[PDB]
């Protein structure tokens, strides 16, 4: 992820097959001729897509040019949350499944994993950063683990918590009204202002597949994340 001063990000395509699949996803959704009602609504929850980009002298070096969802913030507080019961996709090998489940064996139980957060503290005029190991350490501590993101401005930011719930609810509504796509190892990016208040966007589409059914695992995760955020409002 290269943050570009024009309010876009450049995401380098992952190695195959993951990078190509993500390019394919954005191309399907943001097709110039697409009038699929489901996919039209889905665009609302994605970063805007500006097509494939490569350096003038390096056509090999493929990027997606995406909206920087943090652009409109002064001191953005950012959290990435992987959603779903399974982080492996429907065509993973036994080896590959074991790799993925071992990273977070509570994924089935909890249905989401905090990949990281950056939290601005007014207090000290500085950022607090948590990495992959933070979220992977949370057990059924998850409430306190998520709460940490919302400690800003000499308070618990229940405004940002409530905003996040309302925006996730829209994404949840989309997932309850579609059975065309299932999403594995994809994330929600949360942004609020740490200095019309919150951003929640779906990101990371290297394991999105056509489907016949509700994405039950994703829905479980969204529902559970909402339930946790809901409980934080009672703090």
Ligand X SMILES: c1ccc(-c2onc3ccc(-c4nnn[nH]4)cc23)cc1
Q: Which residues bind ligand X (CB under 6 A)?
A: 1, 3, 9, 11, 47, 66, 68-70, 78, 189, 203-204
Rounded Cα gap, residues 32 and 21, in angstroms: 19
Residue 99, marked binder: yes
Q: Does 166 belong to an annotated binding site?
A: no
Spell 215-225 as b/e; 16+ CB within 10 A means b. bebbbbbbebb
Closest distance to ligand X from the beta carbon of 66 (Å): 5
Neighbouring C-alpha atoms within 13 Å toward the C-beta of 25 = 28
Residue 78: CB minimum distance to ligand X, A: 5
CB atoms within 10 A of CB 148: 15
Which of residues 11 and 207 has its CB atom nearest to ligand X in the complex? 11
Residue 14 marked in a binding site: no
Structure tokens at 131: 């990495």
Q: Per the annotation, does 97 bind a ligand? A: yes
What's the rounded Cα separation, in Å, for the pair 156 and 135? 19
- Rounded Cα distance between 82 and 189, Å, is 9
Q: Is 18 annotated as a binding residue?
A: yes
26 Cα distance to chain centroid: 15
Would you say 146 or 206 has its CB closer to ligand X?
206
Q: Which is nearer to ligand X, 27 or 70 (CB)?
A: 70
Residue 26 or residue 88: which is nearer to ligand X going by CB?
26
Q: How far is the CB of 70 from ligand X (least distance, A)?
A: 5
Binding residues for substrate: 18, 82, 96-103, 132, 207
Binding residues: 11, 18, 67-69, 80, 82, 96-103, 132, 204, 207
């Amino acid at each position: 992820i290269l943050q570009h001063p024009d309010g876009t990000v450049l995401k380098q395509l992952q190695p195959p097959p993951r990078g190509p699949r993500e390019l394919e996803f954005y191309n399907m959704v943001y097709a110039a001729d697409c009038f699929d009602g489901v996919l039209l609504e889905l665009r609302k929850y994605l970063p805007k897509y500006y097509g494939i980009w490569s350096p003038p002298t390096a056509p090999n070096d493929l990027y997606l040019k995406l909206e920087d969802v943090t652009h409109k913030f002064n001191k953005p507080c950012i959290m990435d949350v992987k959603i779903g019961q399974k982080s492996y996709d429907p065509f993973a090998s036994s080896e590959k499944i074991q790799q993925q489940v071992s990273k977070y064996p509570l994924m089935e139980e909890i249905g989401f994993l905090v990949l990281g957060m950056r939290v601005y503290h007014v207090h000290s005029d500085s950022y607090e950063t948590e990495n992959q190991h933070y979220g992977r350490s949370l057990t059924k501590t998850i409430k306190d683990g998520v709460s940490r993101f919302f400690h800003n401005g000499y308070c618990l930011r229940k405004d940002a918590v409530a905003a996040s719930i309302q925006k996730i609810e829209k994404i949840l509504q989309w997932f309850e009204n579609q059975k065309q796509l299932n999403f594995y190892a994809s994330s929600l990016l949360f942004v609020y202002e740490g200095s019309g208040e919150v951003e929640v966007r779906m990101i990371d589409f290297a394991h999105v597949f056509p489907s016949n059914t509700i994405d039950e695992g994703y829905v479980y995760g969204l529902k559970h994340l909402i339930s946790v955020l809901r409980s934080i409002l009672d703090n």
